[PDB]
Paper text:
Herein, we employed yeast surface display of synthetic nanobodies to identify a protein ligand selective for [name], a critical repressor of fetal globin gene transcription. [name] represses HbF expression through direct binding at the γ-globin promoters, eliciting the switch from fetal to adult hemoglobin (HbA, α2β2) expression during erythropoiesis. Although [name] is predicted to be largely unstructured, the protein contains several well-ordered regions, including a CCHC-type zinc finger domain (ZnF0) that might mediate self-association and six C2H2-type zinc finger domains (ZnF1, ZnF23, and ZnF456). Even fragments of single variable heavy chain domains, termed nanobodies (Nbs), retain antigen specificity and can be used as the POI ligand in a PROTAC.
With the aim of achieving specificity in ligands selected for [name], we produced ZnF23 and an “extended” zinc finger domain (exZnF23), which includes the C-terminal unstructured region that diverges in sequence between the two paralogs. The extended protein fragment, which is 69.3% identical to BCL11B (the ZnF23 fragment is 93.2% identical), was expressed in Escherichia coli and purified, and the recombinant protein was used in a screen of yeast surface display to identify synthetic Nbs binders. An initial Nb hit (wt2D9) was produced in E. coli, and its affinity for [name] was assessed using a pull-down assay and MicroScale Thermophoresis (MST). Affinity maturation through random mutagenesis of wt2D9 was performed, after which 7 Nbs with better affinities were obtained. Of these, [name]_V102G (hereafter referred to as [name]) and [name]_W108L were selected for additional studies because of their stability, high affinity, and specificity for exZnF23 of [name]. Size-exclusion chromatography coupled with multiangle light scattering revealed that [name] exZnF23 is monomeric and formed a stable complex with [name]. A crystal of [name] complexed with exZnF23 of [name] was obtained, but insufficient electron density precluded modeling of [name]. Nonetheless, the high-resolution structure of [name] combined with maturation mutagenesis data suggested that some of the interaction with [name] is mediated through a loop in Complementarity Determining Region (CDR) 3 of the Nb. MST measurements demonstrated that appending ZF5.3 to [name] did not significantly alter the affinity of [name] for [name] exZnF23. However, neither promoted loss of BCL11B. Together, these data indicate that Nbs [name] and [name]_W108L can distinguish [name] from BCL11B and target endogenous [name] with high specificity.
Residue numbers in the entry: 2 to 125
The structure:
């Protein structure tokens, strides 16, 4: 079972970025998938999760209304559309997919997202 995140990089505060994650090696349509992040110096946190059918979602309080999770079961992919990004959203983002039985969850290797503050928006 393997997961690979696509997308990442630098965005100016207020901007948007879409992350994707594709899974291989088993059936994923019957289990939840999601995204965690580890901001500098912080504990890793569950950012968003989505049920097998897509009919239920979960968001961390600090991203509600700004991030949207969705999935394409035919591609075994999960997406994180990040809008209204803020510098506090700077983190390594890890996709995850659940399965029945130990080890219960697989994690991707992570992708860096960096959101620049206004101090960098002009030369001074």
């Amino acid at each position: 079972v393997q997961l690979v995140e696509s997308g990442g990089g630098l965005v100016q505060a207020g901007g948007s970025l879409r992350l994707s994650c594709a899974a291989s090696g088993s059936i994923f349509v019957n289990n939840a998938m999601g995204w965690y992040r580890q901001a500098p110096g912080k504990e890793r946190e569950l950012v968003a999760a989505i049920s097998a059918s897509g009919g239920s979602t979960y968001y961390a309080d600090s991203v509600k209304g700004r991030f949207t999770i969705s999935r394409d079961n035919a591609k075994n992919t999960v997406y994180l559309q990040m809008n209204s990004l803020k510098p506090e959203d700077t983190a390594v983002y890890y996709c995850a997919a659940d399965q029945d039985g130990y080890p219960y969850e697989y994690w991707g290797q992570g992708t860096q997202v960096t959101v620049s503050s206004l101090e960098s928006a002009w030369s001074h």
